[PDB]
Design a protein around this ligand. Structure first.
Ligand SMILES: *[C@@H]1O[C@H](CO)[C@@H](O[C@@H]2O[C@H](CO)[C@@H](O[C@H]3O[C@H](CO)[C@@H](O)[C@H](O)[C@@H]3O)[C@H](O)[C@H]2NC(C)=O)[C@H](O)[C@H]1NC(C)=O
Ligand SMILES: *[C@@H]1O[C@H](CO)[C@@H](O[C@@H]2O[C@H](CO)[C@@H](O[C@H]3O[C@H](CO)[C@@H](O)[C@H](O)[C@@H]3O)[C@H](O)[C@H]2NC(C)=O)[C@H](O)[C@H]1NC(C)=O
Ligand SMILES: *[C@@H]1O[C@H](CO)[C@@H](O)[C@H](O)[C@H]1NC(C)=O
Ligand SMILES: *[C@@H]1O[C@H](CO)[C@@H](O)[C@H](O)[C@H]1NC(C)=O
Ligand SMILES: *[C@@H]1O[C@H](CO)[C@@H](O)[C@H](O)[C@H]1NC(C)=O
Lengths: 46, 48, 46
């Protein structure tokens, strides 16, 4: 997403292809979710 | 007069086709942006 | 904010108006707030 911009759905671009597009925001929120889970799990033990 | 009046009211747009109006200060912003001094630097100094 | 840069404050620009600017980070984190707060709620249960 830092390299690319968007317009419309794929029904219009002739010769378009499918590939997964990486969001460099996402694993930074996934890691912050695994950090978060740890806080949730530890908060069970006391 | 037509070249000058076209310019001050529409910028380069009459050179391509029909004239498109644009506010001058803003236009000058596109100019500044063309020589790479980012357009804020005009509006932040418009009086000067 | 992905379309726009920032510079200075709403006194200097002749003819500046008022309009919201939308940040795609924000509801990406607000859905992370409601995902979070429901894990706070269920952890109160056991
Ligand atoms: C890239 O992904 C596209 C969407 O995931 C995919 O389009 C989908 O292709 C399938 C298989 O051809 C279609 O499956 C349906 O085909 C017709 C209706 O179109 C039905 O008779 C069938 O029973 C079946 O349900 C999908 O409809 C179609 N989706 C869309 C939105 O068009 C592309 O094929 C993928 N391309 C590549 C190169 O991987
Ligand atoms: C665009 O939105 C701005 C933010 O809402 C708005 O600014 C606000 O304007 C009012 C009226 O001028 C100010 O009201 C205060 O004015 C003085 C203090 O400066 C006090 O005597 C009053 O009791 C009152 O508290 C706001 O404080 C001011 N806020 C900010 C952050 O600037 C603009 O007026 C809006 N402009 C247009 C064109 O809609
Ligand atoms: C490209 O050319 C081949 C024939 O060599 C054809 O099968 C294919 O469908 C063409 N692709 C597009 C996007 O038109
Ligand atoms: C668990 O939480 C307590 C505070 O309640 C903290 O002292 C401790 O270091 C935490 N341990 C882990 C592994 O998160
Ligand atoms: C809450 O956590 C328990 C495990 O302690 C699980 O069984 C339950 O499905 C969870 N419910 C929600 C709404 O997360």
């Amino acid at each position: 997403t830092d390299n690319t911009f968007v317009s419309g759905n794929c029904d219009v671009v002739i010769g378009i292809v499918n590939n997964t597009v990486y969001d460099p925001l996402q694993p930074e929120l996934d890691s912050f979710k695994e950090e978060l889970d740890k806080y949730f799990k530890n908060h069970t033990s006391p | 007069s037509a070249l000058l009046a076209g310019t001050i009211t529409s910028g380069w747009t009459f050179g391509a086709g029909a004239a498109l109006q644009i506010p001058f200060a803003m236009q000058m912003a596109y100019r500044f942006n063309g020589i790479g001094v980012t357009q804020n630097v005009l509006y932040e100094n418009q009086k000067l």
